[PDB]
Write a protein that binds this ligand. Structure first.
Ligand SMILES: [Zn+2]
Ligand SMILES: [Zn+2]
Ligand SMILES: [Zn+2]
Ligand SMILES: [Zn+2]
Ligand SMILES: [Zn+2]
Ligand SMILES: [Zn+2]
Ligand SMILES: [Zn+2]
Lengths: 436, 436, 433, 146
């Protein structure tokens, strides 16, 4: 019948791309952004129709983390074994709390690279719980003995749970991990994730630090296997995000047509010029490294000295030079939902050497590039884009660490609906118990 | 010893291709058509030998529906889940009633694109029941997460029932659906249907509206997989019929060598010129769209807004322009046997804009192109062609909706045997209880 | 909505139990029988309300066959192998034709002892097709190496298809046959049939002739296994029907609590007194024997008896003479020559036509015990399953072998065959529109 | 074929998911439902729940209305099977709660040693005196009906 209009005046309006605005105003018609500009120039059309108005210090688009892991693991096992042993109900319950906190922190979009993102996003989407927009990969695809693999378990236990062969009862094809070997098997692997509703595909294209036995210098999967994985994704209009450390894996991922790279630890002059020339998103995921450098190995298994300082330093140079060279960048934390995503911003500025303005851009305007065609117009405060907007109390351009205080976010709009705000309940506005 | 001759004089004789005839006569020696021409010019040879004679107002060849679905589903589940849950005995019993009604309506040939057509055609062929000529594909071949897939069930349950791996007791390889991924698996899939006696192969080469999660714009299967499927069919002298909506799937099906396309919703100038240049049958299957547009979504699941009006309109333009451009066309309803196939005729004329004469041609003379080399000489009232002939009471050229009245068909000949006629029993002429 | 009343006047009315009536009348309110008595004594309240009347020569209740086999096998394999190889879709299609012919012959109830009766009764019940009332056992339960078994196949192929272990895709638990060994396995076997909706349970409690290698003198299953099978049925208010030939199997079935016996070929004085004292239904199934004695065996496997044929006759005859409750079963596919069993009742067992009609009607619902409604008799309150004839069967019992001789067929008070009534019965409409 | 059973699915799909035979990947033994037939199988069924940490055991001891095809008048499981289920629970200091409607199922549950009954729809004079004399909890669950 009639559009639901909300007007928001802002002391400072940070739009995602382009300079921030002073004493500006933004309008929301229903689910989308109807106006952005200085407070003076608001259409009178909207002044007449609105039924809601807020004034806030700082206004900016909703934040994205682009590397998240919907695990909800039990705290029993230190390594990936928890992934398999944890019953998905326990995981689901925990992932609820995490998605809440995420939203409560102004994170309105997540790209889940391994986990139950697909299965949980439906409890979000029927409104049984609340959370960011979730763009899941279903399971990460890994070769046998790949970064995905659980080396501490016998191969049979692992491939029984996560292989693409021998269908069976017990939610075959719907785990955090998917082990495929060969061109035939990777086809089913890609397709099994699409079946769950995945909006991006994740591959382990090089060795990793979290897996116990495997070496990050070396590539994983064949060029043959990766080409197919990309093509399979491309046909359903997904893109592939590749986890890579060594240069070998990085170049294989680029050759195959992957469009997002994670960590990219051994990126050098050649890699940056490529990622630009080919328009590939670089996601450093620095948080993990800095968290554990400071931890000095609390929380990890002793074989995760793999990260070392050779890796830690290389990784930094890669991120820094990528910035300097002008590679498109977005921000990922590599943690559970509700984890300290805000940190990545800090490290963008302090370690990569961005301006706060650019770090905000990597968290907002650029972040939807992480799912390519599955993204709407969003991550920016601009007419026509999706009304995912948040309001602040302090100016992040002065202090970027402001995001690490959840109370500093006062208003949270996702799809033009208000989930956190003054005298707004824990499950957002006009909330009602879905079980009645 | 001696040929069984039947003479039929007709007020109007509509032959399938070429102008209709006035006050004509047709002869049947045994299983085939011995003469067509004006009543005056009957060979005296036949006048001397005949033991049967009928005069009817209108005479035309037996009708074909070219997209039918031998499911016989229980009415319990709304989606494809019924396909798996329904015991094939229940389906078989129901498909009997359907085949009867079909014949009773002057449908003497069906092309079953997914279902038990092969398994039921043997109860027809031993004469335990009666029905049209059935040309089944056995199961429709679909990729995992394809249009064939039952998304509401766990992947394991589905691939256990319908995969081409892990042979087992319980009629492995003989369902309504067949899920193959990769070049190796599609080979067995094609071959499993041939094993059942299938005379055509059906692929889902694009997303569909009836399946819950998948998007009709995008292609399905690899070009690699489809090439093989075509070649496998070609070697046994079958052809492949491809279900396609988006242009992407349409062009992939054409490149692979498919020779029938279903729906073809996003066909445009480029597609029509191809289907002609390459001699590919276009089967619109409009009934489904119009039935549910009028229903306004009664009978469907809420995620079948996929059809939308974007799809519904596009589809119409495709069909219309295909007609205008002179693409070879045949008629398919996409329903169970006994369903309202007669409707498709109406929509041919009223929506596609055919003349009634051309709509009859798409239901008769063209329809055997739908199975290529597996077709005899049939679907036309012409010397040497198979004696599948029906008689009417009213002239369909004046009113095409006449077919929607089953009583308007008074005589039904299949293989020169009379199944419906004056004082002819429910199981046709010289019928006897097969269980004595 | 007012009750739909139909009145039928009859020259002769044969009610099932009790003497037949002359110049009688019967009323049907909706699904059930509202009045039976002489034409004179019809309640006037029904004369005022009826919207239909018929007059027919002979009126009697709808017929039952109590041993039927919903197989719909392909004609390729001559033994039980056809059972496994035939795709159930082919079977279903065929079983449709059979059920039609059945109804068209005045058979309004069938007890299917092995086959797809449950799965097909679904297509009957939603009215997609027509057929008698079906009371299926799902699969017949047999031990390994039992009468059920397909000896010509390797044991693994058979138990993969029909065992109660190793669930899998492909309609596990829903075949013509079910092989269980041991007390634990027979519990699942009984239960798997109930799952399909079965209203009776069938066991092979002795060797048979239609299986390739087993001997009909010997018992099958353990007393232990049968006791459990009975108890499992009893808990869901089914009863067990046991196929038995040798005395050994017969007495084991009776001891376990089975309430219907099939063939009962070696029944003697002791068995008859038991079946009466315990109230167990005797179903001879003579048709098979006489069909193949006349065939001189053509159509069977060489492992088919003239000794057995005689014993079987004596059992049936003496059972009749001794007054055992009897019903009639042909042991064929639906549509098959059930009418014959009547003829043999009279001519071989030596019953009067009246008693043979009673075994096909009034007694026949005893074959499913508590699963039976009030039916199989033309009597007030009983279910309106009624048929009409042209000739008097009491004079010639062979009249049933002529399907035209049945002119009217009412099942559940709905008319499926009658004057100017279509092939799928009255007010029929294409279910696919 | 119990109240737990999903009748609209083929039996194999159901027992693959919920049976106590054929262990496999995919959280075998950890669903909403557990189908056991026979004394040997019910032992594992009770035990599989304790494995998950369960503090009570639930049996369907009669037909229900929320399952598609089964009749609430009739009992379910054998007295034999229930006795074992109770004993298995008792050994780990759990008790058994039985879902029952028909008197047949109610009395079989009481005889086996169940200590909580659900719905108890056909309870009468005899059942009440028993539940008191034996100290069995009655839980009506009226909400569903109303
Ligand atoms: Zn990673
Ligand atoms: Zn990661
Ligand atoms: Zn289609
Ligand atoms: Zn279709
Ligand atoms: Zn027998
Ligand atoms: Zn038998
Ligand atoms: Zn309950």
């Amino acid at each position: 019948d009639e559009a639901k209009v909300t007007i928001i005046y802002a002391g400072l309006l940070i739009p995602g791309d382009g300079e921030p605005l002073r004493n500006a105003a933004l309008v929301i018609s229903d689910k989308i952004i109807a106006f952005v500009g200085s407070e003076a120039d608001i259409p009178k059309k909207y002044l007449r129709s609105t039924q809601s108005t807020h004034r806030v210090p700082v206004l900016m688009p909703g934040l994205w983390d682009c590397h998240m892991h919907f695990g909800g693991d039990d705290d029993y096992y230190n390594d990936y074994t928890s992934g398999l042993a944890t019953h998905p109900a326990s995981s689901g319950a925990r992932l609820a709390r995490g998605c809440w906190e995420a939203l409560q922190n102004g994170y309105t979009s997540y790209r889940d690279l391994a986990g139950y993102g697909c299965e949980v996003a439906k409890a979000i989407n029927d409104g049984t719980i609340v959370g960011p927009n979730v763009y899941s990969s279903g399971a990460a695809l890994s070769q046998t003995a790949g970064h995905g693999d659980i080396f501490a378990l016998p191969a049979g236990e692992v491939l029984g749970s996560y292989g693409v062969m021998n269908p069976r009862p017990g939610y075959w094809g719907a785990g955090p991990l998917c082990i495929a070997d060969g061109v035939e098997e990777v086809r089913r692997a890609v397709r099994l994730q699409i079946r769950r509703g995945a909006k991006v595909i994740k591959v382990m294209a090089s060795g990793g630090v979290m897996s116990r036995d495997d070496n990050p210098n070396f590539a994983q999967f064949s060029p043959e296997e990766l080409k197919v994985i990309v093509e399979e994704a491309a046909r359903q209009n997904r893109i592939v995000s590749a986890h890579v450390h060594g240069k070998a894996g990085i170049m294989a991922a680029i050759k195959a047509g992957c469009k997002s790279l994670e960590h990219v630890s051994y990126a050098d002059e050649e890699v940056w010029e490529l990622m630009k020339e080919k328009g590939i998103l670089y996601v450093a995921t620095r948080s993990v490294i800095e968290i554990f450098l400071a931890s000095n190995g609390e929380g990890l298994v002793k074989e995760s000295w793999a990260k070392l300082q050779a890796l830690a330093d290389s990784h930094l140079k890669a991120y820094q030079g990528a910035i300097k060279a002008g590679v498109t960048i977005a921000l990922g934390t590599d943690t559970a939902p509700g984890g300290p995503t805000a940190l990545e911003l800090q490290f963008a500025v302090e370690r990569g050497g961005m301006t706060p303005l650019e770090a905000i851009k990597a968290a907002t305007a650029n972040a939807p590039l992480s799912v390519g065609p599955q993204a709407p117009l969003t991550g920016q405060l601009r007419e026509g884009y999706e009304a995912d907007v948040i309001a602040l109390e302090e100016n992040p351009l002065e202090d970027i660490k402001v995001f690490q205080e959840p109370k500093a976010v006062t208003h949270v709009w996702k799809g033009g609906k208000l989930f956190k705000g003054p005298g707004i309940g824990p499950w957002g506005e006009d909330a009602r118990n879905p079980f009645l």
